[PDB]
Symmetry: C3
């Protein structure tokens, strides 16, 4: 199924019938960072498997729902269970849910992920406002836009210079200052490792040389599809380890440690993003 | 359809029947840089769609013809409408037209493209003679030769050390000196970004660190197929912007600006390449 | 055919019926470096084409056998004819033979390859004990684990920090010292170039900047599958040229020169690995 205008329209039609909500904000939350979705008010939960043309996700299993409702007086749509390219999903499968958001009315997309720290200033538990990226899959002919261009959504050759909105970054920092946790908030450049192996010690050393501050396995595909069709983006990484320190000290990286960091910061991240949604410009 | 000896032979048979021309020079021209093809003498235009085993190009649309005839007394074959890998074409689809050129008798291939400047010496409107490359798709298991080797055309493991012929570079510079535009002509290393997003500001900064002078989304696949089967190459980039300056000044990159640069240099590039063809060794 | 638990079990069942050997050591030997396999004692040769669910290898041709037997009193299984990803094999085809080794009882995998030297200390004929890697295909969404995770074999997100066992490296060096060829033995970081073109002169210069000591087109996919399912690895490169010197002196790289180096070191490498197998811990 191609992520074209006709197919995205059919999915949006189903959703609008079922939900009644016209959202102008979208959210995609990282693993262990989805509590906010359970607090959406007057909400409607739509399993992906029920929506025409949505990608099949049963081989991976686990949760996969679209959730619509209200937060802070604002109308939002959330993806509960994101699609990652290391699972084998195609370019068309990743892109279709974001293009459906566009047809539903989304103008701003907020994204969180868990990532490894490269910059020596980063500790476990810190947050990084993403200000740019290095897309190794894109340089290597696995960009999410490889294929025919869908002209109704955007141009053949997108410019990513303003993919990460500066005013949204400034609003997120302002709110952290108001609640006295700005000492946790950094900015930086995100390297996309296709994955699913964690970056090796020598890959981490290479990324430090190349100007990367953070490394992870998600987010860049969604950012590019959003930028192509004119949706503004704020993306925030939660740092689970510093891979450069771990390489110097021969310390292991593992998913169990990652999820414990997520639990430690989940409630603060939920409160932060609730306020961001409330404060977004009108 | 595999780009093998049998399938390329069937395409060449069709062409030879229709055209009568036995070319020993091939040309592939960049977008907005194809005026020379309209001035081929005693010419024959063959739509790709008519040629056995040529790749299907109707999803992308736009022009796609093989043109045979004479320039400056020399017999040439031109591709009018090149195939780019960011459109989703396979390794076999890119390679088959170059291997057909080989069977038709081509010994020299001249290639132009539009590209972004990385080296701080490069301005919009400059030309770069390509002397080497950094192939990010090739390092990342998307090389144009991934697949079974077609032994009749070349070896399993090609050496690219002499892919860009030095004497052809020297002849191109000599002609620029004769016509007093050598101040526009540089040499440099080309980075292949699979695309179709332009290089991000942080990718541009990375390429500067890694010794790249220019970045673009074409040319390297054709160069590798030509080198594999023993065809000499001259490749020239027309610079449309300096991405490092644009990153420092927060200035946007876009296809409209690119095509205006192409129009500004099209007639000079046509005259230059006409003389190169005329002067090629016998 | 997916490299899952059911399919690997069916292959292992065939093998166990035919061979009687329960191996706890596996070997994968580089091209021209396979003489040891001909000296396996009380051996059984099983063509890949006869084994249920093994990948089809007839397009590439050439030898493809599993060989079981004894070396130095130890029970081993060897792959005679390795699968390389530049031939077009899928992730599932590369992984299935290593997962079969796991089900057969393999706890240690010894691997050799031929490679190019980047570090200026490396000469043709030197050996490099691999201590880490830079996986360009993995960064670029062509990692061998892209796809659904096979949970019975290992975790969704493997850590590669200890992929190259330190004690095995120390044993290999100890044996070289006992036989007075330690002056040939280095350690270093391996860059995986998907291939099949040799690294270009400018790619070689880039790899030097990024901390790579050696570059080649194999080994990293097998190492990752082995690490995922808990098999210890020793990997050794035989250096056929120094690509940085060749770039400075405009000297060519070619498969014929490579195989002559292999012949020069084959008998010493055979003796070295025979002793390593004999000395492996119990
Ligand atoms: C949570 C996480 C993700 C990634 Cl890709 N890398 C690290 N080191 N940590
Ligand atoms: C014309 C062009 C092509 C490319 Cl790939 N990049 C830039 N900056 N400009
Ligand atoms: C034997 C070999 C392999 C590779 Cl990938 N590169 C070089 N220079 N040499």
């Amino acid at each position: 199924v191609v992520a074209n205008y006709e197919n995205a329209s059919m999915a949006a039609d189903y959703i609008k019938r079922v939900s009644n909500v016209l959202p102008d904000i979208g959210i995609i939350c990282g693993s262990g960072l989805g509590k906010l979705i359970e607090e959406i008010e007057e909400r409607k939960v739509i399993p992906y498997i029920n929506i025409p043309n949505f990608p099949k996700t049963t081989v991976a299993g686990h949760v996969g729902n679209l959730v619509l409702g209200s937060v802070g007086g604002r109308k939002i749509v959330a993806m509960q269970g994101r699609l990652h390219m290391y699972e084998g999903y195609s370019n068309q499968e990743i892109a279709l849910p974001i293009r459906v958001m566009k047809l539903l009315g989304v103008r701003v997309l907020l994204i969180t992920n868990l990532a490894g720290g490269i910059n020596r200033k980063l500790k476990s538990g810190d947050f990084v406002l993403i200000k740019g990226h290095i897309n190794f899959p894109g340089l290597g002919l696995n960009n999410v836009l490889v294929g025919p261009n869908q002209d109704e959504f955007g141009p053949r050759f997108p410019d990513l210079s303003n993919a990460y909105d500066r005013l949204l970054q400034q609003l997120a920092l302002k709110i952290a200052q108001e609640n006295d946790f700005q000492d946790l908030v950094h900015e930086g450049v995100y390297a996309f490792n296709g994955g699913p192996t964690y970056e090796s010690p020598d890959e981490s050393n290479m990324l430090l040389k190349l100007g990367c501050d953070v490394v992870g396995m998600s987010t860049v595909p969604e950012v590019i599809i959003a930028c192509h069709c004119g949706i503004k983006v704020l993306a925030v990484s939660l740092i689970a380890n510093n891979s450069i320190l771990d390489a110097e000290n021969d310390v292991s990286i593992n998913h169990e440690k990652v999820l414990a960091v997520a639990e430690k910061r989940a409630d603060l991240l939920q409160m932060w993003f609730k306020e961001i949604i409330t404060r977004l410009p009108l």
